[PDB]
């Protein structure tokens, strides 16, 4: 029921050319739906989801114009930050920016985010209230003072609570079969004898959305974390996600070990055993 729209920008300076590499990616929920890559021939924001091709040419002109200007801002910013940090012109450096809005099940604005980084570390971020900035260091404190003078927080907040929610709602209505919906995990157990005396139980969750999920083991009613392994949740490539959790147990004693699966798409957490 809950949804989000996010944009991610990455600019990487090049000690050879000048024009940094700029890549912008838009998401609705976990679906990339638009991209711009300054390396590409088109020099346009391009569609990456079927349902966004329903947007008119007015749309693609406004979006291409915006991200190109952002890439130009990032290019100036790379120079400004090189100066703040007294860095040479010879190294490659990276600016990252992300922002976006979350809505609850009723479709109303729930929270907004905006955060910027330099060389893979926090630089400046909008606070949870959407009214003030957190600067990680003395250079970002200069940026914060500049942004306080130009009402940058107010502008970002107005977008996050307004146009961000408005267009997120529009895209959600554009998406139909292509827009991934809540999908409960399909579960199964595998069992691999290791030795004359141990075996691996692997609890699988497949085909689920959203990606948030909790797999836990219990031995005779109590949580078991020793002798367990858990892979990071991973995308299946089709809009759904996968995860597994494994436990090593005395062979033949598998009946004591239950996988518990918690997911928003389940009316009640699932339990399963070998």
């Amino acid at each position: 029921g809950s949804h989000s729209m996010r944009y991610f920008y990455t600019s990487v300076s090049r000690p050879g050319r000048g024009e940094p590499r700029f890549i912008a990616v838009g998401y609705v929920d976990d679906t990339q739906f638009v991209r711009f890559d300054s390396d590409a021939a088109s020099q346009r924001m391009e569609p990456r989801a079927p349902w966004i091709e329903q947007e008119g040419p007015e749309y693609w002109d406004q979006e291409t114009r915006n991200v190109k200007a952002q890439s130009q801002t990032d290019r100036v910013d790379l120079g400004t930050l090189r100066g703040y940090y007294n860095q040479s012109e010879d190294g490659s450096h990276t600016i990252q920016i992300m922002y976006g809005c979350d809505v609850g099940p009723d479709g109303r604005f729930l929270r907004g985010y905006r955060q910027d980084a330099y060389d893979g570390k926090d630089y400046i971020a909008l606070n949870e209230d959407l009214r003030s900035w957190t600067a990680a260091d003395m250079a970002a404190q200069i940026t914060k003072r500049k942004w306080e003078a130009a009402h940058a927080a107010e502008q970002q907040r107005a977008y996050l609570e307004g146009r961000c929610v408005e267009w997120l709602r529009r895209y959600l209505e554009n998406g139909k079969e292509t827009l991934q919906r809540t999908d409960p995990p399909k579960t199964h157990m595998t069992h691999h004898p290791i030795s004359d005396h141990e075996a691996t139980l692997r609890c699988w969750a497949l085909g689920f959305y959203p990606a948030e999920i909790t797999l836990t083991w219990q031995r005779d009613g109590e949580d078991q974390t020793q002798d367990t392994e858990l892979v990071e949740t991973r995308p299946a490539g089709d809009g759904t996600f996968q995860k597994w959790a494994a436990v090593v147990v005395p062979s033949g004693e598998e009946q004591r070990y239950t996988c518990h699966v918690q997911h928003e798409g389940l009316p009640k957490p699932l339990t399963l055993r070998w």
């Binding site: 979006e63 952002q70 267009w167």
Partner: peptide, 9 residues
């Protein structure tokens, strides 16, 4: 739709 360009750092 995107936010307009961020304020220069």
């Amino acid at each position: 739709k995107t936010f307009p360009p961020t304020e220069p750092k």
